[PDB]
Amino acid sequence: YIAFILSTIFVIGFVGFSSKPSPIYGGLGLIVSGGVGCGIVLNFGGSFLGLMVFLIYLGGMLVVFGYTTAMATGDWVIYDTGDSGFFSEEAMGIAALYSYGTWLVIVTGWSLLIGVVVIMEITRGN
Amino acid sequence: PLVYMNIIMAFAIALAGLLMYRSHLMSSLLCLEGMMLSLFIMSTLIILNTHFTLANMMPIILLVFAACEAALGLSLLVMVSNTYGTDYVQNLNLLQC
Amino acid sequence: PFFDVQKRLGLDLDRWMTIQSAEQPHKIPGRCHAFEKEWIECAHGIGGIRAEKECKIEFDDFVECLLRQKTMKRLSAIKRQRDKLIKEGKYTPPPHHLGKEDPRP
Amino acid sequence: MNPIIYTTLIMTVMSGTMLVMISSHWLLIWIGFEMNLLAMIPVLMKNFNPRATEAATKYFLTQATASMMLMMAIIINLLYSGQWTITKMFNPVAMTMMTMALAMKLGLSPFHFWVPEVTQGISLQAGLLLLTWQKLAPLSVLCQISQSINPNLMLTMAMLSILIGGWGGLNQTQLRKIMAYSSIAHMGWMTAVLPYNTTMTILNLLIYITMTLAMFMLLIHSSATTTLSLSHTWNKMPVITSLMMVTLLSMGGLPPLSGFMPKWMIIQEMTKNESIIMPTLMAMTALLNLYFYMRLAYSSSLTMFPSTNNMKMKWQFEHTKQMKLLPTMIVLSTLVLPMTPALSSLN
Amino acid sequence: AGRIASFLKNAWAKEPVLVASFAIGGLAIILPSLSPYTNYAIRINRATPYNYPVPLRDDGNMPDVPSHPQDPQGPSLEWLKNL
Amino acid sequence: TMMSGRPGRVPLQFLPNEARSLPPPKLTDPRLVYMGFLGYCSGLIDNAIRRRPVVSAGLHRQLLYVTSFVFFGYYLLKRQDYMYALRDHDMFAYVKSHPEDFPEKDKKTYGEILEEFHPVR
Amino acid sequence: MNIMLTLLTNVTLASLLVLIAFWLPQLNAYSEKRLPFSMKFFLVAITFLLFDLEIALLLPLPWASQTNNLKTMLTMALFLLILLAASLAYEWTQKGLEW
Amino acid sequence: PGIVELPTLEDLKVQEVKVSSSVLKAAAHHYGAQCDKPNKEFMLCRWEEKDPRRCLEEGKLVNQCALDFFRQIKRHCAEPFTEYWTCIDYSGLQLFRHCRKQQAKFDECVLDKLGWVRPDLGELSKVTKVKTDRPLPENPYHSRARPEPNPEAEGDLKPAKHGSRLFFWTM
Ligand SMILES: CCCCCCCCCCCCCCCCCC(=O)OC[C@H](COP(=O)([O-])OCC(O)COP(=O)([O-])OC[C@@H](COC(=O)CCCCCCCCCCCCCCCCC)OC(=O)CCCCCCCCCCCCCCCCC)OC(=O)CCCCCCCCCCCCCCCCC
Ligand SMILES: CCCCCCCCCCCCCCCCC[C@@H](O)O[C@H](CO[C@H](O)CCCCCCCCCCCCCCC)COP(=O)(O)OCC[N+](C)(C)C
Ligand SMILES: CCCCCCCCCCCCCCCCC[C@@H](O)O[C@H](CO[C@H](O)CCCCCCCCCCCCCCC)COP(=O)(O)OCC[N+](C)(C)C
Ligand SMILES: CCCCCCCC/C=C\CCCCCCCC(=O)O[C@H](COC(=O)CCCCCCC/C=C/CCCCCCCC)COP(=O)(O)OCCN
Structure with missing residues (x-):
């Protein structure tokens, strides 16, 4: 029940940072929770998505959160049976974004450009 | 099963913590981000278990949009602080019902 | 409300990603491809009300494939009965289930 | 901001709404809501002051929480059925979560608290946009999944919205808060008929949007945000006050004006489903909205309040910018009752 | 033509990094549509067998379908070897 | 009634082709005259408002309005007439195809x- | 489980070495005697976040090049990079990269 | 509902091919060239019936064909094959390109003994055709009867009787 143990820890870290003590410490709790969740995804078989959590989430977004704060004051049964061939299905589905998800790429890129513009306009001040 | 339940429970705990609002709007943003992380884990597990290949883009997409929202929220927080010198929630009482 | 621009123009903006059984890359099947295909073919062209009433068998099988609640319940019952029997002392596992078996390629 | 940037942001808001309206995939609907929220924040904050910033952060927090629960409902629905299409909801817990998320997006009671504060904080143009355009996407989503809504929860929230709007409007001297409470009551009227007929919902939405556009444009023309400031308009442009009085009478549901068409139709539809008590209570409660509309009409055009000396200078000047479609909005919000059977166009 | 040449000459001085960036980006945009080897890359991607080739049931009406891998019917990869 | 899911319906057509079998509204229709009055x-x-x-x-502006x-x-009148015609058509077809739900009253x-x-007394 | 053991060993050695470093010189006896909140740094952090999101979008490119739809994939990758360059240009032109 | 039918353990007895992955990889090309027919029959049956229990005889046949192939290799080309698969077994990726020399020897030997020609590039991935006497299954999905569609009313449109009939409106 390794997966279950990870899940219990995940919930404990969530309870820890959800009490909202000293937002720096809440950020540390959320960092620990994100690490445990990435471990859950990695142990499941989603290597790329777990590493995406670990890189994007932890190293960009929580890093920016901590920077802004610093400026201020049962298992194993439901699994498959066969194999995936000579590739990983998760990588194929993720790479299908450029061949199948043209609409998704268009809307996401437009949203990100609009987000840059919006951030600049909001922080302008005056 | 149990794993799914824990992930949902984490989402409910994060939502409750967001709705508590002791102080420190930064804590509200942290609760929102925890909710999104729970959603990411849950959707990834569902998509991987059922071998929905084309749905593997969906978590990434979610993450990206959520982080964009996070940036937006952070900007708002900063502006509020630049008006009051603190991110205290009780300072946002100029507008009332 | 819903303006079916895709159906009017034949665009396919997001329909490619709506179901498991719709043209996956490298022809990789979903775990419940057959159940979903059967349920969709049962319910097609009939409407939501009649589909809910008349295609309940296919949807039940699809949900069983998706979540495997009945299978896990049956396995749990068998395992619990085995544990009770071994605690009492009347059943013993064979060498196949104790790691003493002969594996095959 | 720069006019090019403002136009781009407005187009992004409309494009997010249209993406919600045209997509058949739950993820694309969520993306449309996200795009709309992202582009909406600068529009509220266009005139920079602490009140506008506070309103923007309140709106952001509310909409972000609603979008998070919407994603959770989508994921639960996918878990219990490998479906991404917007159809029957397949799960009661997921459907309750979706209904609550859309209710907070719309501002229905008990999630109504943010609407008056956000409307008071922002300017009149931002309030116009927020109270007219920002209702299309959640209502369209609710219309698409109407056959799965639990009628008890929907009717409870609708009746609560009507009561809360009626009671909260009685206490207001600020015009923007009056508009916010009126919007809450009209949202309750719109959502009380979703379980039975979505055409009635759309008709009510169209009539309400026309009336709200007319009233907001009249308030912009006579640049008033309080009752006493509006009481000075008769001494500069009495025609504006008379038009506003007729529009306010229409907004109160008085026949033979246009605002009577929705309630009438909705009542009829509800009676066709053996529902008698609820439409009766709904009309009784709309009497409160009519009362505070009448109070505004008393202070605005039916009596003459004292003026000031410096008003004389204002007599020598004319409005430089004239809003097109204002006369059309007034006529459409006052005199379309004889054309009621046109609703079969499935508006 | 003089103004554009003057602008290019003034940009090559005091701003060479941006000139190189725009040149490389434009070349990357334009060249793939003119190269003849992009079709070869598509063909190479097509000829990579990731899945098992499921045989077809013979009914005596498929002369183009080989009955053995060594049969001359079917697609060939001599062009790939010659590349 | 909810004819949104009616079979054979083009997603964004204001007036279908089958709507052309119905008589068009007359140019002296009272509803058309009321629309002109609204203009x-x-x-x-x-x-x-413009003082x-x-x-x-x-006069050109008023003429354009009307x-x-x-x-x-x-x-709009054409579309409304077509929609009511569809309603009646479906009602009659359904009554014809389900005779056991609509018996002839003796x-x-x-x-x-x-x-x-x-008595009134 | 090999990666788990490797991480455990690394963390254990780091903790042991730091603890002995912090406790070895603590056995002998000795004497034993704001506001500013720069906007520019916040802007740099936010620009990093948005550019990192666009990198997260661009990451699956090594696998995207085997699809048989090479023209569509190339078009979409160039679209993503062009919009990233446009974001940089917009931040540059509106004085968002100054100190 | 229902009982899952499973074949007896006796039905699953067959002389197993007891060689490791390196030996199989060394002889994979000749094995595909020589044993194509039973393998393609088995794979067509497997993809058509969609049931493991309906394809057991073809599996025993492919096992027998592989055994015959390996017996021929053993009786004719033992030592060059041994060197070739030792080559292949050394590598962590089992690459073909490291010691082509040994491969050549093996190829030469078989070309002298069995007249076997190694299939070229792009040949083992061809989609071939199979001539089988096994009848085509008619309902491999075990589907039920599809519910009948809706009546699909059709006719000529007539004006609505007395118009909209909404309250007091005469049109
Ligand atoms: C079943 C219903 C049947 C009837 C339908 C009724 C509605 C129809 C019309 C609807 C609206 C369209 C026209 C109104 C535009 C407003 C303009 C205006 O104010 O009038 C000025 C203008 C005269 O003034 P002016 O010297 O030109 O310039 C002065 C400035 O305009 C400004 O002058 P000022 O600033 O010096 O004076 C200020 C004054 C100015 O304030 C106003 O007068 C504003 C007008 C009220 C707002 C309009 C509401 C919008 C429509 C809603 C209608 C509700 C009907 C529902 C029933 C409820 C009844 C309330 O405001 C005040 O004194 C404040 C005190 C407020 C008193 C209480 C307010 C009650 C308002 C309710 C009125 C409802 C009926 C109005 C009838 C028409 C009124 C002109 O009036 C006219 O002469 C035009 C009226 C129509 C022209 C008819 C010509 C056609 C004849 C050709 C031949 C006959 C045709 C047959 C063909 C066959 C023959 C061969
Ligand atoms: C029709 C109305 C046109 C004008 C109105 C435009 C409305 C707003 C703009 C948004 C519309 C987007 C149009 C593109 C829709 C995507 C689908 C279409 O393009 O087909 C794709 C073809 O891809 C095209 O090459 C995409 C090119 C479009 C991107 C270039 C410009 C995009 C700008 C759009 C607006 C965003 C902001 C503006 C920036 C300047 C799919 O390729 P295909 O391989 O067959 O099918 C995939 C499935 N397979 C794998 C099974 C085969
Ligand atoms: C105050 C009264 C309301 C005024 C409304 C604004 C008036 C100006 C708008 C100009 C006309 C807009 C119509 C757009 C042109 C083509 C529309 C066509 O492509 O779409 C059709 C749809 O056409 C429109 O629905 C009809 C709009 C007509 C509105 C008039 C009804 C008003 C109620 C009666 C009051 C009298 C008003 C008369 C004076 C204006 C097909 O719809 P469909 O994609 O298949 O289904 C989606 C809608 N569902 C989900 C509800 C079924
Ligand atoms: C069409 C292809 C597009 C895709 C490729 C893009 C790749 C990445 C490049 C874009 C990144 C962002 C660029 C942002 C542009 C900002 C320009 C700017 O404002 O800079 C000016 C300075 O630069 C300028 O003058 C404006 C641009 C000058 C022209 C640049 C090149 C234009 C095109 C030249 C190449 C054309 C094609 C080459 C063909 C050659 C033959 C192969 C101000 O600089 P300061 O920091 O303020 O310092 C000034 C005080 N010391």
């Missing part, structure tokens, strides 16, 4: 019906 009222209100002589300020209202009203005569009498 005239819009023109008068436009004159009044111009209400009756005789812009013409636009009449144009849109004509097309006609009775008031001379053989016993109705209670209540």
